[PDB]
Amino acid sequence: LSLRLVDGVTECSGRLEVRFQGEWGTICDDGWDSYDAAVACKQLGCPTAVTAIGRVNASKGFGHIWLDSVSCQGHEPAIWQCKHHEWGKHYCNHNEDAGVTCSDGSDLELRLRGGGSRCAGTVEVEIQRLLGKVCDRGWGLKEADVVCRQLGCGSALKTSYQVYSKIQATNTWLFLSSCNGNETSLWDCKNWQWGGLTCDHYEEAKITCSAHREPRLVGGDIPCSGRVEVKHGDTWGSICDSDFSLEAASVLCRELQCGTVVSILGGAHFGEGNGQIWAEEFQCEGHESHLSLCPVAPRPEGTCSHSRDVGVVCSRYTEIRLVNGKTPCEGRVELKTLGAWGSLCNSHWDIEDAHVLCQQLKCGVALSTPGGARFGKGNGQIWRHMFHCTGTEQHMGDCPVTALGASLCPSEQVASVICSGNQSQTQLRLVNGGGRCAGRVEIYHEGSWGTICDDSWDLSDAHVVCRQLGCGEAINATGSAHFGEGTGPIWLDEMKCNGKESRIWQCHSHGWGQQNCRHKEDAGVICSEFMSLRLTSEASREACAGRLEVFYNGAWGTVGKSSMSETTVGVVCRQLGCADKGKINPASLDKAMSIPMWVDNVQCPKGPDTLWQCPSSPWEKRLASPSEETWITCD
Amino acid sequence: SDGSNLEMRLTRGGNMCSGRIEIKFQGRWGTVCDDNFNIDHASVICRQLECGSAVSFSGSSNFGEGSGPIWFDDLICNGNESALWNCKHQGWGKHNCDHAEDAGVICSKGADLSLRLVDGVTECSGRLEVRFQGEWGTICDDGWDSYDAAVACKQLGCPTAVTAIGRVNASKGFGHIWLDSVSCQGHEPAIWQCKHHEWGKHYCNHNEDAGVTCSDGSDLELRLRGGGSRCAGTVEVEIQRLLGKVCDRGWGLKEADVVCRQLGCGSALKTSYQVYSKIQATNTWLFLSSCNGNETSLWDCKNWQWGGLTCDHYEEAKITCSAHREPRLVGGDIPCSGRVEVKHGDTWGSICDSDFSLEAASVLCRELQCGTVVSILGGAHFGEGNGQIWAEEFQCEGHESHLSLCPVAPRPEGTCSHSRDVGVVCSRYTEIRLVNGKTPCEGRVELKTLGAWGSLCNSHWDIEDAHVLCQQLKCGVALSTPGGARFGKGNGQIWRHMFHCTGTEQHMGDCPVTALGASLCPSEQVASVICSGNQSQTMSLRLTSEASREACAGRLEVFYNGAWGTVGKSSMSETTVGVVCRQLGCADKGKINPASLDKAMSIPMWVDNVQCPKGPDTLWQCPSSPWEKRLASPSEETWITCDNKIRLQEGPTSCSGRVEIWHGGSWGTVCDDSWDLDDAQVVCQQLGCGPALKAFKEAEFGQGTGPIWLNEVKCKGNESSLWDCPARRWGHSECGHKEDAAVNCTD
Ligand SMILES: *[C@@H]1O[C@H](CO)[C@@H](O[C@@H]2O[C@H](CO)[C@@H](O[C@@H]3O[C@H](CO)[C@@H](O)[C@H](O)[C@@H]3O)[C@H](O)[C@H]2NC(C)=O)[C@H](O)[C@H]1NC(C)=O
Ligand SMILES: *[C@@H]1O[C@H](CO)[C@@H](O[C@@H]2O[C@H](CO)[C@@H](O[C@@H]3O[C@H](CO)[C@@H](O)[C@H](O)[C@@H]3O)[C@H](O)[C@H]2NC(C)=O)[C@H](O)[C@H]1NC(C)=O
Ligand SMILES: *[C@@H]1O[C@H](CO)[C@@H](O[C@@H]2O[C@H](CO)[C@@H](O)[C@H](O)[C@H]2NC(C)=O)[C@H](O)[C@H]1NC(C)=O
Ligand SMILES: *[C@@H]1O[C@H](CO)[C@@H](O)[C@H](O)[C@H]1NC(C)=O
Ligand SMILES: *[C@@H]1O[C@H](CO)[C@@H](O)[C@H](O)[C@H]1NC(C)=O
Ligand SMILES: *[C@@H]1O[C@H](CO)[C@@H](O)[C@H](O)[C@H]1NC(C)=O
Ligand SMILES: [Ca+2]
Ligand SMILES: [Ca+2]
Ligand SMILES: [Ca+2]
Ligand SMILES: [Ca+2]
Ligand SMILES: [Ca+2]
Ligand SMILES: [Ca+2]
Ligand SMILES: [Ca+2]
């Protein structure tokens, strides 16, 4: 008895044969596992580093079939010392004659071809200088992550490429049984078959790993803004302002974990780069988790100038730390804004915000908020930001934040949080009214948002609604669908609140779902902390020019001109929706209403698009001369 | 030798139908070399040893060493031969194989084949497994249908009353796939005895493993869940003890009709259901393929599949049968009139007045084949029920076929007591019968009017009217209308209704009819019709007064023959005065009063003794005495004062309270949307109370009763009639009864 390989590609590849009684026959495919191949290559003079089953390059054999159902365990010195069934005692057709491929691991290569970069394309496997593809047999993302990890390109996203289908065709295929998604190389996947079988009705395997179009923000004053860069494989390049869109920025900031897009800026706003410039039009739908999944139009024949880079500013720009604590997960809150650190007041600081704060720093569910200055009094600037987190947001930048006109507080009233430090630890809104503290009232119950009926809806009910929402007292409890009809269920019909209840559902009502109303009687509230902005002038052709008026506590007022800057007028103009910059103007037209001025000394940081997050002096309702009133004109 | 003395034997095998081939010749046993051995030789061999259907052929050491000479070599054989020695060969005893172990064969009758079911919800259910060469393998479901499943169940030994395909609750097995494309015919004693692809490790890929579910029919149930009753919702099945849904591969109305018939809810209308509840998820599904449509149950369909696939890219099947909300008219003195009752699946209830609109009445009269709606009555006109009082509002649009398709808005327990049940009067109220005929398709025409039957007068009777009459009685086209007393003279009143059917009407009540001033005719001139029997065959009125203080409070004049004339007072009843008042544009009530102001023109009379039946709203359909222009004294001349169309109700005094307006036979309310001073001014202009000073909202004087007619009234402030102003007229008002309007005015 003796073994041999025939019509492979080296001395240790191809169809396997055994001589019995003096005649040369083959082994059957059934029962042929990696252990059997290891035993066979141990018997032969071949390396045993990688021992894979399969008939690379081999055609249908010829002769007798002499063995089948080989059940070796890797503890025997020959293929025929195993628990073979019986000599010539079974049937296998000649299309499933056995084969092996054995290597020392020095010439087994994998590469993706036919794509925009090395991490997207059809998978091509080169074994012993023979090049072929991989067939889709359970080829999921779980299988694909092994290949992406082996190549060094992030994690797999989808099984498809885009460009350059001009790939050389071959008739040899690689078959994967099942892999855990846990291995470092596809060669470590259990029982992968090389060649022999052919697969029709089944196409080649496709890959696009995450490192195909990695985005990055390079230079900016605040954490999540700057010039946009994309990595083509191994090389970094900037993006033209022409080939970009709001959806592209949204998916870019979703990939980088920086929240929803708040600003897209043309021109070298953050500085001209030094590198390659791509011309690749992104056509993102907007729901993709990565830029790699974005379909991209092919390159045109034109090229941009380097001074045409595009920049992005996104929501999550809030820098908060804990200081003066025994551990990093306990201490006093300090927030960076406008260029300096400082402590945080606890006028509107509660547990719901501490949860999000300790989820930002990965310290688990918040435990308590010690009062006074238990971890230390303030020794500098005190920021008066009131955070109104619901509690489910993952970062303080997602929460609604108000800093305009905030009221001061003494240094002995600074917030601080102590937290568990264990990572493993883990219901009312206003809509369609504009802003957060005015509009139709909606309540969450039974997994759905519903409305409150108009009947018996008076100002005392809006007191409780806006006390729960943190908007202070109410000014209007409106009905008859003032802000528009809703959609969905109606949860509560009659309100008999005292006006002192802590939350809305402490109120007396007929019971959940006990309603006799329709969607034209939806309830709405307008409250003290409602803010709106406008520009007024007398019968002009343009509306975005004139006197700045802010709405607060139900009354209009003007804004002081002291300490104004270009960025403040810019954010005001953006909020009104007319331009991204503007210029202050003297007291024009020498005529206006004598309404007083509500707030003065407004300072804006980079990143907010709404004036409400610009810190300023506390509210004051005093009369001012037309010299102190602010007039702006936006371009 | 002709081959009679030769004999063949199977040796060293598992049994008689297995092993090495041996042939006896010249007193010596010998074997046959395996050169050029194919399935044809095996088929030939497994024919004369009585073991049939050659399964496998072997070679070399499959059956050990042979002994003796070798008789045959390099034989060529066909697939159908009498014996192995009937083939062409080089010669007896001639061979050049240079081998020692010879050929062996395995026929079906000796192979240790067996069949079993695994991974099932019962002893016999789930995936099929067949033993071949000692290994258990699966069957690919390429062309795996009910006949094969029946054969499998019969072989297994468990009941064959209902046999279905599909692997329920079973996962695809790992191993060989021994059989593929089985084509059993429904009587074979075994699955492998049929025609099937040759035993081999198939690569069948587009398909999955095969399995069966056999049952006796007493453990299969079908239900609907998520709907408003047992006859609406998503369809759920319970086979053995496992629940599932039905995928909508071919879920047509022809498919849903079978389900509705099985449940008993009449017929299928729609493939969607308004959702009253959330239903749980379920892993296994049921699949169908083009049932005939006349099947009594879904278990008698063709090759339905239970399990085996996950219905993705397709959604669950859902239906609403006719019995979901089945209407009925009860307590009526005439057909197509009475109190409305609705069956909610299997219970009858009476509906409340405020939940019904004219569109709902139209759809009800259409579904009952009762025609258009002529009036909606409230306040238990036909009497109050004695059962449940459904409290769901109907949001019907027009042109709907059944009351089940309507959207429905549920409400809490009803505020209304049992004395607010609604009723309807539709259009087809004409009772006609054919009497004194050998068959109901021919005979005398009797018409039921007032409270009695009578013989219709054939003065204006024509063939088109007979066509309509016999289309009503489902008797097809009428043949002829015999004259004279062909079927016997009348035995009572002779109604003189004049029917003017066009010819295409489906009911005699949809034809125009006139009975006022209808001339008399003798006892022998009486109508009667005979028909084929093959069912498949197919005037003005006004009220005058010296001054027009109101609009309907004066002397009555009828227009005929180009002149006006007053109407007699003899036998004037409440219903006749109501009909006149309603026709002339005021509420459905009035009172007759003696002549006033004694200055009406001395116009002659036209008609006397006018009696009006229930159901018609126009005066021309009321039987009476024939026209005559006799002069009449003012003592016999009629004067009527009708109730106005706009009243104020529940107010502490007159000229104040809730606005109620009459239409469609019922008193409805006015919604408070855009209820301001101009509309109140118009309202108190119609009523003779003078200028208004305030308009009220949200049912200040009391919550109303009935439908709602007007919405978003936008009077300019000087319109003569509130019903001249714009508004969402005739319902559609999206207001409850907490929005009833009210007016206060200067006395
Ligand atoms: C797949 O297997 C076939 C054999 O069935 C290989 O074909 C033969 O490969 C051998 C190398 O083992 C070649 O022998 C040498 O070829 C060169 C010329 O190419 C000559 O200089 C040497 O004297 C010697 O003959 C042989 O030519 C070649 N024959 C053919 C017809 O291809 C084949 O190489 C294998 N596949 C691949 C991709 O290598
Ligand atoms: C769905 O298929 C599963 C397997 O894929 C079936 O699992 C097992 O089925 C048995 C009855 O057939 C269940 O009851 C067991 O019965 C025996 C006696 O007959 C007893 O020894 C056990 O203690 C138990 O009562 C068994 O729980 C069940 N096991 C599991 C993990 O499901 C199953 O019957 C099929 N149907 C359903 C509805 O799951
Ligand atoms: C509700 O909002 C309305 C406006 O939508 C307010 O009515 C105005 O209130 C101002 C006071 O700032 C008065 O000068 C105006 O004359 C009012 N207009 C009208 C048409 O009445 C009202 O104050 C708000 N609050 C309440 C309780 O009604
Ligand atoms: C993942 O791979 C590691 C490295 O060999 C191994 O120890 C571990 O068991 C694997 N885990 C699983 C779930 O396969
Ligand atoms: C149902 O109708 C089909 C033709 O549409 C007919 O072949 C079949 O026999 C019918 N079945 C029954 C049970 O009447
Ligand atoms: C109607 O108005 C009059 C006149 O102002 C007033 O005296 C009377 O009380 C009012 N009626 C009601 C029911 O309010
Ligand atoms: Ca093995
Ligand atoms: Ca209301
Ligand atoms: Ca209410
Ligand atoms: Ca209240
Ligand atoms: Ca079949
Ligand atoms: Ca209203
Ligand atoms: Ca109006």
Author numbering:
A (entry chain B): 264 to 689, 718 to 926
B (entry chain A): 152 to 689, 822 to 1030
How did the manuscript describe this experimental structure?
CD163 is an archetypal scavenger receptor and mediates detoxification of free haemoglobin. Detoxification involves haemoglobin binding to the abundant serum protein haptoglobin, followed by CD163-mediated uptake of stoichiometrically diverse haptoglobin-haemoglobin complexes into macrophages for degradation. CD163 contains an ectodomain consisting of nine scavenger receptor cysteine-rich (SRCR) domains linked to a C-terminal transmembrane helix13. The CD163 ectodomain adopts an architecture consisting of a ‘base’, formed from SRCR domains 5–9, linked to a four-domain ‘arm’ (SRCR1-4), of which two or three domains were ordered.
The other two three-dimensional classes revealed dimeric and trimeric arrangements of the unliganded receptor in which the arms of neighbouring protomers form contacts with each other. These classes were not seen in the presence of the ligand, suggesting that the ligand can compete for the formation of these interactions. The base, formed from SRCR5-9, adopted a similar arrangement in the unliganded dimer to that seen in the liganded dimer. The surfaces of the SRCR domains which mediate contacts between the arms overlap with those which interact with HpHb. Interactions between arm and ligand will be in competition with interactions between neighbouring arms, providing a mechanism of autoinhibition. PISA analysis shows that the arm-arm interactions have a total interface area of ~590 Å2, while the dimeric and trimeric receptors have total contact areas with HpHb of ~930 and ~1445 Å2, suggesting that HpHb will effectively compete with these arm-arm interactions and explaining why we do not see these auto-inhibited CD163 conformations in the presence of ligand.
